[PDB]
Design a protein around this ligand. Sequence first.
Ligand code: GTP
Ligand code: GTP
Ligand code: GDP
Ligand code: GDP
Ligand code: CA
Ligand code: CA
Ligand code: MG
Ligand code: MG
Ligand code: MG
Lengths: 439, 440, 425, 427
Amino acid sequence: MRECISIHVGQAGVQIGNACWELYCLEHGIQPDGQMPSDKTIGGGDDSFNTFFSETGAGKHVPRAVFVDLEPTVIDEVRTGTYRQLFHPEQLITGKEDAANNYARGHYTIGKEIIDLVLDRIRKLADQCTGLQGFLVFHSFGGGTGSGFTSLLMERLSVDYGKKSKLEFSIYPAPQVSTAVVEPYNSILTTHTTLEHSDCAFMVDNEAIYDICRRNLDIERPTYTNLNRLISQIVSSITASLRFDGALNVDLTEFQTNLVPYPRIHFPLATYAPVISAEKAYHEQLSVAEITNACFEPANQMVKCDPRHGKYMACCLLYRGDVVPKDVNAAIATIKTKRSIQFVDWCPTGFKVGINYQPPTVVPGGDLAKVQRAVCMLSNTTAIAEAWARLDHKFDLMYAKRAFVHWYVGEGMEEGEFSEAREDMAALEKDYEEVGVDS
Amino acid sequence: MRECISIHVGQAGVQIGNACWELYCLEHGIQPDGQMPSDKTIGGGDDSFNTFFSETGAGKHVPRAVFVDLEPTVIDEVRTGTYRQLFHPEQLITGKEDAANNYARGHYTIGKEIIDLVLDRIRKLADQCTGLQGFLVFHSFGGGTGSGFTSLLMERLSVDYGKKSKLEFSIYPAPQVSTAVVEPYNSILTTHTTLEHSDCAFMVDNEAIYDICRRNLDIERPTYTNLNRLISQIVSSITASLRFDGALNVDLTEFQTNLVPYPRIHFPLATYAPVISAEKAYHEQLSVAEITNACFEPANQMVKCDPRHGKYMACCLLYRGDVVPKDVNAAIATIKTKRSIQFVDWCPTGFKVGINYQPPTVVPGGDLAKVQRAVCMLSNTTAIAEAWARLDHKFDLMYAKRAFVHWYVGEGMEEGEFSEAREDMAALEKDYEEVGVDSV
Amino acid sequence: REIVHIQAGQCGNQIGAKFWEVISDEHGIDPTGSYHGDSDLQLERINVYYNEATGNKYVPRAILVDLEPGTMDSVRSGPFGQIFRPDNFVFGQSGAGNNWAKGHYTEGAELVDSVLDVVRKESESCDCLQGFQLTHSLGGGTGSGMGTLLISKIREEYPDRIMNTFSVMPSPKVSDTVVEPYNATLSVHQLVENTDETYCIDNEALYDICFRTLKLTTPTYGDLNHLVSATMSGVTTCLRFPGQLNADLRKLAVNMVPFPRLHFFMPGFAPLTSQYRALTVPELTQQMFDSKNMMAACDPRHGRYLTVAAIFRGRMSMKEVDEQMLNVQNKNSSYFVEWIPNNVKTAVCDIPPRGLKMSATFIGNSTAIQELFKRISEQFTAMFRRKAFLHWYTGEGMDEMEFTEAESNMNDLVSEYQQYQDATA
Amino acid sequence: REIVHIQAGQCGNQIGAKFWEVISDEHGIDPTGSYHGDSDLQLERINVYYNEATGNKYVPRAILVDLEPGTMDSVRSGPFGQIFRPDNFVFGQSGAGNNWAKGHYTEGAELVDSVLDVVRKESESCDCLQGFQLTHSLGGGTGSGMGTLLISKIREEYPDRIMNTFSVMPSPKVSDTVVEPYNATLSVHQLVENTDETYCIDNEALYDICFRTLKLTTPTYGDLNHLVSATMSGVTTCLRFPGQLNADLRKLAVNMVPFPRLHFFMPGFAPLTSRGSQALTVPELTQQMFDSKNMMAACDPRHGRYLTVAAIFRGRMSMKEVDEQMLNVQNKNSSYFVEWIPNNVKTAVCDIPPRGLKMSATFIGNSTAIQELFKRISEQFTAMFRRKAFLHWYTGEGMDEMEFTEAESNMNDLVSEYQQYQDATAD
Ligand SMILES: Nc1nc2c(ncn2[C@@H]2O[C@H](COP(=O)(O)OP(=O)(O)OP(=O)(O)O)[C@@H](O)[C@H]2O)c(=O)[nH]1
Ligand SMILES: Nc1nc2c(ncn2[C@@H]2O[C@H](COP(=O)(O)OP(=O)(O)OP(=O)(O)O)[C@@H](O)[C@H]2O)c(=O)[nH]1
Ligand SMILES: Nc1nc2c(ncn2[C@@H]2O[C@H](COP(=O)(O)OP(=O)(O)O)[C@@H](O)[C@H]2O)c(=O)[nH]1
Ligand SMILES: Nc1nc2c(ncn2[C@@H]2O[C@H](COP(=O)(O)OP(=O)(O)O)[C@@H](O)[C@H]2O)c(=O)[nH]1
Ligand SMILES: [Ca+2]
Ligand SMILES: [Ca+2]
Ligand SMILES: [Mg+2]
Ligand SMILES: [Mg+2]
Ligand SMILES: [Mg+2]
């Protein structure tokens, strides 16, 4: 058995972390007071859910999680929420002043005076681990804390916990819900300073989650609660292999082995189906062939891009529910001849299929409906480089005039770090070009 | 706080001070014995009228004023007049021999025997102030005391009170009621001496006031009593900003910043309207537009000059009575087009407006009719330099022959003091020429 | 969290008292300081401006400063006069005489330490102080001379806090003295160096709105201040109510200040009041970007928008404000710089101002603001070319070198705005 | 402030006695000294010429002086002889014999110490002393010689005070002796140096007014003195009544004396009619006042130019009429006023008129035409000095001959100085 520690940084990481841990309890039958009636080994055990939950002497199941934010307003939501008794007061770390959407403020100024406290609370959970395998870090790209402080945490985690895996759940910046104009800068900065301290990163564009909530779920103006409940469904089905018995992606090393052939290209695209509204009383039931076909529709991807004009390097189909393997490869046979699937020539054109018989769970009162089968598609395609191209262009427009740079320089960062980070993205954008594009 | 001490020097300063303080008491409701029944705060207070009146424990309201003359006959009229109980005996200072229309005797021979006594009485009044604002000095230019002693007093006041503001209410001489032939001499001498000791001086041309009383009031031969009752109305309008309060009331020092662009150019031109008799004021309502239009008529100014032949550097309208800002803005816009008001290019072409709501009052038995609204215009125009030219020409005519100069030399002055004063007058005329010239 | 408010001078105290009386009514605070509102959103961020006195009383974190006791006793005698702490009234007796030199170097120097003692006493009792906000005029003496002196002194002791000011520009249409361009040019020289955010409230624009739009032939200062309080309430809504666009002063500065010296904001309000017909969201957005609603006498079409913060108050559909704002960006796409992507941000608050069902407040950093400083510079040069009225300042120890240095800094600011008005991408 | 009045010699005491009669009648003072008047204006400035003794007895501040006791025993016998202070009489016995040197150098020198003691006595009782006025003649010996001696002595002890004189020019038409031109020249030389104001009362002009105008074939000293009394009552109105124009002797000197040596005024009086003629207007007074017939000095003002002029009107009249008529006569006679002294004509109006007149007008002019008066005296002087006539009268008292030429050369300069400014122009 090998334990995983989750770290939630910034407002986006905390609020998404709140939605995920609520979902984990609903799936495993864990009550808000930490009790788990279905668990027969009181105060210990080596079950699959023990990779994410630790048990006290009183049978209380505690999430192996750490919440960090430089302002206490977002953490107080967890401290007085529905699952307030689930966490210990030491798992929640609040600052007094946030990073003001400034990467330099969260990395150099506020991060310097809080990095040792966060690592101390992390080491206290690691000492409770018999075989810690790695960490999962939840953070945003545009926030000052989510980008600035996260970058420093991964740099330190590589030192204190070498040889351990580190997985990212990132929030790509979208203007419909953005709160700062400097998010493009902060995004490029954290990406360059973490590229060598992350083994796999699941990027979620708020633009895609926003439109999925509007089209598929009939929310006129989606809020963070709507976005986070949909995002936690994707995070749940990605981490379900760690929390349930199985053979595909049983440990964090297998994620990088199955999905990451080249280390710098560790941004796999996620596609989820079906997304049905609860108010839809009429309840059609899509076959495995229908939901697998929807995994190749751009409208269901976590990042809006066109995989038809890219190349695949790895592909993982994660089914959840009433799914038999006979129906899966039958759909893969039909999808071969109906879609534009082009793998790189140094990889096998194939699919790694994982089936979990337990169907997905929906939060009572949410916007998502109960389904009998669902698919989460993790594919490493070069088409995701479009997100890097859009981000680099917005960076180039602002940095050409040195706009807003004085906020970063006045915080201790030197201007040379900007072009150093931009040069890394130019190299990353060309790494995708060499793997995918031909003559 | 913001108390003002008034100094009245010589016959003209004393007799004008008598008219002003009689008018002040009528405006505030102060009886000739110093009692003010409307005043609820006995022995003191920080009311608006307290800038000019102190209070005793007995409820008497005493003017913050000093009357000084080198001869007693003019002040003796105040000691036995209607308002004799208003002043303390220490506020009225008299000598035994006047300056005999000689600047030299006022500033030197006779003045030096009484100057310390005068400053001691001024110090006693200044000590009773919580925040002394400045001095108002009333005097004539042609008298021996009004010119010579006033110069000595202003010089001593700058030594004892630094750069504390000092305002002048001066009487420009006129041959109609002139008492000396050497008045151009004393006028040039006192102007040169006090020039750098005065922050702002309001000249009153005796010939202008004499002519206003003839045309507008139908007095066939005006006397000092007629002239002073009109002069005190201008002084009342100027100081009404300090003695009263109100939302539209603008302090005079706020006008002083607008009125004086350069230290030596501190001679505003005053204009009052309406000056009408009771026989003509009957069946005759005078609107805001009519009295504002009369301010730009050259035959209504305190000093004989033609403002059309000069350039304006500042224009302040001081309304009192039944006047609303809507009427003022309408009248100003009308005059802006029907009149040729040329401003210098180095300052905005605006009109600073202050409105008091206490209507003008008249002394019982006076020549002025009681009106519901009045206006006093303070403007800084280069046209006032004409008054300097006329005065300097009379000086040059007599000094070329050294006529009457032996009366000044015999008292201790040198001929160099005459040419030094005349040279300063010539520089002042050039200064008024330069400010009117446009920018490069 | 906490913000310390300072009002200095006649104009600063008169608009400052109007600001406290308006926002107290919005947060359910009566003149005695008791809570009497129904919504819990009123006390959520009540501590950003009010200190909680023992007994459920809310005293404002305000400091009243002046060189004469005139306006001070007038504020204490009006409504919401007893809500202010009595120990935070700091006044002298001499006055400034509309002289910038008297407020900054001569008369304000005697009282500047008494003010700093109250500033420290209020800042020491702050859990998480963000910075300071100041209300003053630039054409007078106290709020202009002593106001910029207080900013310099406070920045010395709190260098890392945010300095924010509501500065009122002088105009010949509403003029007190002739030396107003002198005091203004000297004050802005200080504002470009010692403040982080400055709201430019032009008395010229306030007059034209009262005259040409509200049809008030003779506008009073009470008529102008009614527009100022409505604008001051709108630009501080994101600081007083729950939200996450510009919730604090620093996050606001990071979003609105792309270059340090260009931190002068042009405010706009809609609708203009002094009405039973209900306004619509497309009409609020249309009037928000119109020059007729700008609080600074500038034509936005004459320049380009660097950053824009729009905020809607009332009960409306977030979808409609998204549609109308994205539609007004397409109508005026030529007036937004292309080198700053997504430079217009929108917030929506549920609590509207009193008497209005829906309102909209515009906060723009536009290069067209250079017309304001160019106007002051032309009036400054016309007098300074002939050294007119300069003896009022040299008599207080000032030098002509200080005037030419302040004028050159203004002209540099103007040409800096012009540099980005023509810069493309 | 007070004025100390001094009268010396026969003529000085005759015209000095008549002076105290008119002003006492004007101020309501009886020969005993009590105030019998009915107007407060008579006592407002009563202390200028009178002392207030116990019992409301007004005593004149007069000092009667002569070298012979004859003429002073008669002024004690005529009217107003009791009102004078008895110890203020200083009379000698030898007399002067119409000799200037006898009064100035020899006999008058032994008496000048007794006169000075009475001067200091009256000066000690003064709150603020103005100066001294002297009535005397220039033709005799005591008033001419000793009169000038009193001026120099008093000036040494009161140098900053005003010295005013009523000097009577001699005339061969009423001449007492023949040596009169010698006494006038020697005394005018003194009056040029030691006096501030001098009213030139010409006996010639006085004789012509009585003979040609008033029609008196045989004019006596009483007829000439009545014109003098009306003059000195006129030129002192501004000093005796609450005016403000030339209220004292120093303010009059500043207005009338533009150059220190040119301080000899010619006076005029209007109306001048006899008891055989029979509606006098303000324009008529103004015209007669600037006529050569009404001048109390034999000088035609149209033969010179007015440096300064003082006009005094007395009686109930329109003040507007005076201002317009005074401005009228100045425009119509613009050539006879020097243009380099602007506004050189001052006008005062007193409410009360003199005794026996409804309205009167007194003239005080400083005209360069006064040189005609000095030219006449100088011509009679040089007619005798060429022949060395009667020099033993003066050299017999130890005097020198060049002292006569000094007094002449001076007078010649006085005439030249008056001519120098008559020809001066402003351009
Ligand atoms: N999906 C999602 N995005 C969020 C959420 N909260 C914030 N974001 C996005 O994250 C970005 C801002 O990052 P935040 O997490 O608010 O910033 P932070 O880490 O708290 O940083 P500072 O407040 O500057 O210290 C914007 O693009 C927001 O739209 C959330 O709950 N869900
Ligand atoms: N308006 C006005 N002018 C006056 C008055 N009294 C005198 N004057 C003028 O002032 C000048 C004379 O000055 P005065 O004030 O009389 O003289 P003084 O200051 O007493 O000086 P001396 O008496 O010479 O010591 C002349 O031009 C007069 O016309 C008065 O009451 N009112
Ligand atoms: N909008 C507005 N402007 C004002 C107000 N009071 C004064 N002003 C302006 O401010 C300037 C004068 O400054 P003021 O505040 O009176 O001077 P201080 O008291 O010395 O600071 C002029 O431009 C006035 O028009 C007011 O209540 N509202
Ligand atoms: N007008 C006038 N002249 C007189 C009178 N008595 C003498 N004179 C003249 O004065 C001159 C003689 O002076 P006098 O009186 O003898 O002087 P005394 O020597 O001092 O006594 C002659 O010219 C006389 O005509 C007089 O009463 N009136
Ligand atoms: Ca267990
Ligand atoms: Ca009182
Ligand atoms: Mg945050
Ligand atoms: Mg006098
Ligand atoms: Mg003001």
